Structure formats: structure tokens, C-alpha cells
Design a protein around this ligand. Structure first.
Ligand code: NAD
Ligand code: NAD
Lengths: 231, 50, 148
């Protein structure tokens, strides 16, 4: 756009639920600024630019940013896995995370939020490895009927939250969205299963109707015979 | 690495699916036979009562 | 439209059953304004613009807004699920929600309404995951006869 005035104090407005790191290379002093405060640089201070991960399969180096948002957000990833029956199928997951900053006045705790410079790619490949590893020993039918408990046990442990203690990033939930087979033949084979289930249900109602018809028929026949003997 | 290997595993997964459909069809057949025999037994007892 | 006068006090009329968040970057003081009050900015205050979710399959980043409405509204979502018989079938649901603000004078409680900057996409994917997970172990006939 228009050029900036190089002689003016370079400054930046940190949003709500966010932080920046800035080190004074001259006076030899770091500081992490929290909250919605406005940050103004000294003559030799610099920002810590975060190279993050983004995209639909979560590629790395896809979103460079300047401040760190530590709120209850979520990010969603697409995981291709394979089961013990060798069923290749891909997932869509959703990861509720936030940062647990116990003290914002601690210079050593708050430094650890920037200890891991790609907090999204790390957690997403970690949960991908965990889910991929646990489902690989589970058959296809058990996974299809119980895939909530399988993945909720694969991500967490023996636990409600998945804390990552290098930076304080907890993961409080996982939300599976779409589980479908990669192979089209697999889906076509499952369509025959659902049409057989429907045919089974119609055969069951026809058999119940036939047995009710036979009961009423025999009851009427018995009353007719007793009436003929009375006549 | 080998494509033939993956193609051989596709036959394994389609056999697993065929096994699952055969299992549900057998369970449905046995439930049908149980209800059929129960109705037949009630019908015979009712014919003797008539 | 016509340009605004940059020298006039920038102001906004918050509706009934709504709130805005506004932080004074100079004097270092936040405030959440409730009710139908008229909000006027100081010389260094700013608004918190909410990027929300909208649409028919509830896509994200579809409705940017400025104030937060916390009334008994509803939003409707379309959920494609699949049962234990592998019956793929899609739903249309409707979600009566409101915000429970116990004290409007509390600076810590009322800050939490903006703690989650996309309250629609979060709740809709959460209920989508729950419904999708519970129906996946239920056969098609039981679901059709008892889906309420
Ligand atoms: N509580 C909630 O449900 C909630 C709250 C706020 C936002 N959201 C939205 O949910 C969407 C999920 O979409 P997605 O994750 O598939 O898109 P994506 O994968 O492109 O998003 C990448 C993630 O990185 C996070 N991020 C980006 N810049 C950041 C920074 N400077 N500091 C810290 N974190 C940063 C975002 O929160 C986002 O979830 C997000 O785009 C987000 O805006 C949800
Ligand atoms: N009690 C009621 O039944 C009631 C009351 C008011 C409105 N409504 C209407 O019901 C409709 C449902 O349609 P939909 O949800 O499928 O359309 P949609 O999915 O496009 O609506 C998105 C939802 O976000 C909410 N929203 C939008 N801007 C907001 C803000 N600034 N703060 C807080 N919430 C905000 C709306 O209430 C709406 O329900 C809404 O459009 C709404 O106007 C119902």
C-alpha cells in the first residue's frame, strides 16, 4: 500500500486472548505481552514471527502470523487411515484446543508458548499418528459401529484432556465429522448391504401379516363349525 | 511399493464385506424361522381347542 | 455510500438483547455494554468484530458482525449421517439457544461471551459430532421409528 513513515514508533495492537513475544536486542530483555494491550517497539526490539500450518490436509508453512492467539479455538484435519481388514478410509476431525497459562507474570512459563513454533502442525500430526495407530488393529465393522469411542480413546489416555506440556496446549475435545471409504468399490459393496437390510424388513412385515391372517381365518372357521353343529 | 500387493489386499477387504452381509442374512433367516415356528405352534393349539 | 465525517465521535446503537465489547487501548480498560444502550467510542477505543458462521450447511466465516445478540434465537444445520446398516441419510435440525449471563456487572463473566469468537460453528459441529456418533451404532428401522 502506501509506504510507512520509518521515523515513527512502530506499533501493533494485540487482540483479545492473544500474546506477542518481543526481545530487546540492545538492552538484553525479553517480554511477552498479553491481553488486548497495544505493543510499541523500542529502537532495537523486534517481533517473533510465527510460521504456522494451515490448509485442508494441514500443510506446513501456510500462514505466517505475528501474534499468538491462545483462545478456545479449533482446527480441523483430514486423516487417511487403514484398518486391520485393510479398509482405506479418510476422516474429518475437529480439535478443540486452548493454552493453559497459569501465571501471565511468570517470565519462564510464558516463554514456553513460543517454545514450539508450529503448534498446529505438531498437534495434528500427533493426533494423526495416535488415531492411525489405534485403528490399524481394529476391524472394519467394529470401527464403523463404534468409531466415536475408538478415536476418543486413541486421542486421550488413562483422561478428559490431551495436554502437551512443551507449550501448555491442551486439547479438550475431538469431533469426528465424515468417515467414508477412499475406494468406490467398498461403498458400492455397502449399498448392497443396506438394500438387503431393507428387503429383510419387508419380508418380516409380510410374514407378520400372513400369521395374523391365518389366526383370524382359523378363529372364524372354528366359530363357523360350532354354529353348524348348533343348527 | 508394489501395486499388485495393494490390489491383492482389495480382494481381502471385499471378502470381509461379503462375510458381514452373509452374517446378517443368516441372522435374519434364523429369526424368521423362530417366529414362523412360534406362530405354527399357537395355530395348532388353537385348532385343537376349536 | 456517502463518506463519514472523520472528526465526529464514532458511535453505534446496540439493539435489545445484545452486547458489544470495546477496549480502550490508551487508558487500558475494557468494557462490555449490554442492553439497548448507545455506545460511543473514545479517541482510542475499538470494536471487537465477530466473524461468525452462517449458510445452509453452516460454512465458517460467512457473517461478520459487530454486536453480540444473546437472545433466545435458533439456528438450523444440515447433518449427513450414516447408520449401523450403512444407510446414508441427511437431517435438518433446529437449535434453540441463548446466553446465560448471571451478572451483567461482572467484568470476568461478561468477558467470556467473547471468549469463543464463533459460537455458531462450534455448537453446530459439536452437536453434529454427537448425533453422528450416537446414530452410527443404531440400525435403520429403530432410528426411523424412534429418531426423536
Ligand atoms: N470456539 C470456537 O469454536 C471458535 C472460536 C474462534 C474461531 N473459531 C473458528 O473455527 C475455524 C476452524 O477452521 P480450521 O481450523 O479448519 O481452519 P484452519 O485449519 O485454516 O485454521 C488454522 C487454525 O489456526 C489458528 N490460528 C490462526 N492464527 C493464529 C494465531 N496468530 N495464534 C493462534 N492461533 C491461530 C486458528 O484459530 C485456526 O483454528 C477457525 O477458522 C476459527 O476462526 C472457532
Ligand atoms: N425465538 C425464535 O424462534 C427466533 C427469535 C429471533 C430470530 N429468529 C430467527 O430464526 C432464524 C433461523 O434461521 P437460521 O439460523 O437457519 O439462519 P442462519 O443459520 O443464517 O442464522 C445464523 C444465526 O446466527 C445468529 N446471529 C446472527 N448475528 C448475530 C449476532 N450479531 N449476535 C448473536 N447472534 C447472531 C442468528 O440469530 C441466527 O440464528 C434466524 O434468522 C432468526 O432471525 C428466531
Amino acid at each position: 500500500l502506501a509506504p510507512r513513515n520509518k521515523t515513527r514508533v512502530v506499533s501493533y495492537r494485540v487482540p483479545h486472548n492473544a500474546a506477542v513475544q518481543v526481545y530487546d536486542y540492545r538492552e538484553k530483555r525479553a517480554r511477552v505481552v498479553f491481553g488486548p494491550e497495544l505493543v510499541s517497539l523500542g529502537p532495537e526490539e523486534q517481533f517473533t514471527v510465527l510460521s504456522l500450518s494451515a490448509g485442508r490436509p494441514k500443510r506446513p508453512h501456510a500462514r505466517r502470523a505475528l501474534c499468538l492467539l491462545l483462545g478456545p479455538d479449533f482446527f480441523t484435519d483430514v486423516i487417511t487411515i487403514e484398518t486391520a481388514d485393510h479398509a482405506r478410509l479418510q476422516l474429518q476431525l475437529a480439535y478443540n484446543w486452548h493454552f493453559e497459562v497459569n501465571d501471565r507474570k511468570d517470565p519462564q512459563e510464558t516463554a514456553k508458548l513460543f517454545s514450539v513454533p508450529d503448534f498446529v502442525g505438531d498437534a495434528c500430526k500427533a493426533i494423526a499418528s495416535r488415531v492411525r495407530g489405534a485403528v490399524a488393529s481394529v476391524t472394519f465393522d467394529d470401527f464403523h459401529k463404534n468409531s466415536a469411542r475408538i478415536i476418543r480413546t486413541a486421542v486421550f489416555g488413562f483422561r478428559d484432556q490431551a495436554v502437551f506440556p512443551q507449550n501448555g496446549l491442551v486439547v479438550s475435545s475431538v469431533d469426528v465429522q465424515s468417515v467414508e471409504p477412499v475406494d468406490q468399490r467398498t461403498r458400492d459393496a455397502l449399498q448392497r448391504s443396506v438394500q438387503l437390510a431393507i428387503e429383510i424388513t419387508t419380508n418380516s412385515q409380510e410374514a407378520a401379516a400372513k400369521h395374523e391372517a391365518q389366526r383370524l381365518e382359523q378363529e372364524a372357521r372354528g366359530r363357523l363349525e360350532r354354529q353348524k353343529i348348533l343348527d
